[PDB]
From a paper:
Despite these low concentrations, proteins have a great technological relevance in winemaking as some of them, the grape pathogenesis-related (PR) proteins, can aggregate to form a visible haze. Plant TLPs generally have three domains and a cleft located between domains I and II.
Domain I is the largest and is made of 11 β-strands (β2, β3, β5, β8, β9, and β14 on the front; β1, β4, β10, β11, and β14 on the back), forming a β-sandwich of two β-sheets. The two β-sheets are stabilized by four disulfide bonds (residues 33–221, 89–95, 136–210, and 141–193). Domain II consists of a long α-helix (α4) and four α-helical segments (α1, α2, α3, and α5), and is stabilized by four disulfide bonds (residues 141–193, 149–159, 163–172, 173–180). Two disulfide bonds are shared by different domains: disulfide bond 89–95 connects domain I to III, while bond 141–193 connects domain I to II.
Author numbering: 25 to 225
The structure:
């Protein structure tokens, strides 16, 4: 499958993918990423305010993946996430936008083939609106990241929405706002669909 990863922000971002790596995308530039059929735990995200040396080692203000330009591991919150698992049960791809690891950059994540048309977006000014307890440089953290309790992180107990998850959910109703926000955040397409991930759509 092909992911068309497009930076429509006026600022440069450093696109990241696992599997895939990462590259600098100036405003208006795009990356076509091949993603094999059957991939699980897939993510695409943007990183902000990075500075990398000649060998691809360095730092990003949001979404840093172990100091690498070409990510092999997930990024450090906050990072708006396009998540996917391809060719799963019932001849389906499963995909979502997640704010469970926070928000940095607005995002659309849409199918582009196979007669799959229903996509996803989170475009609110979540950084400008972020509550004080969640705010950080370049982003808005999920309360699981900030507080690290089961109320927000749901390893055990009864996982329900919280005022801090609801902040994200009412502003981006399409996206996961807390770990068990499954019922209203799950998108599917026929297996084998292509996708776009657009920063600042």
């Amino acid at each position: 499958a092909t992911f068309n990863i497009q930076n429509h922000c006026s600022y440069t971002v450093w696109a990241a993918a696992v599997p895939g790596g990462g590259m600098q995308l100036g405003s208006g530039q795009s990356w076509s990423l091949n993603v094999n059929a059957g991939t699980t735990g897939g993510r695409v995200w943007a990183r902000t305010n990075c500075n990398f040396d000649a060998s691809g080692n360095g730092k990003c203000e949001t979404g840093d993946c172990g100091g690498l330009l070409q990510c092999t591991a997930y990024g450090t919150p906050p990072n708006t996430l396009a998540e996917f698992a391809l060719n799963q049960f019932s001849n389906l791809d499963f995909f979502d936008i997640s704010l469970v690891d926070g928000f940095n950059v607005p995002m659309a994540f849409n199918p582009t083939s196979n007669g799959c048309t229903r996509g996803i977006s989170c475009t609110a000014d979540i950084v400008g609106e972020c509550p004080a307890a969640l705010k950080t440089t370049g982003g808005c953290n999920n309360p699981c990241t900030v507080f690290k309790t089961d109320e927000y992180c749901c390893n055990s107990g009864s996982c329900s929405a919280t005022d801090y998850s609801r902040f994200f959910k009412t502003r981006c109703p399409d996206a996961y706002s807390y770990p068990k926000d499954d019922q209203t955040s799950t998108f599917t397409c026929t297996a084998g669909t292509n996708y776009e991930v657009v920063f600042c759509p």
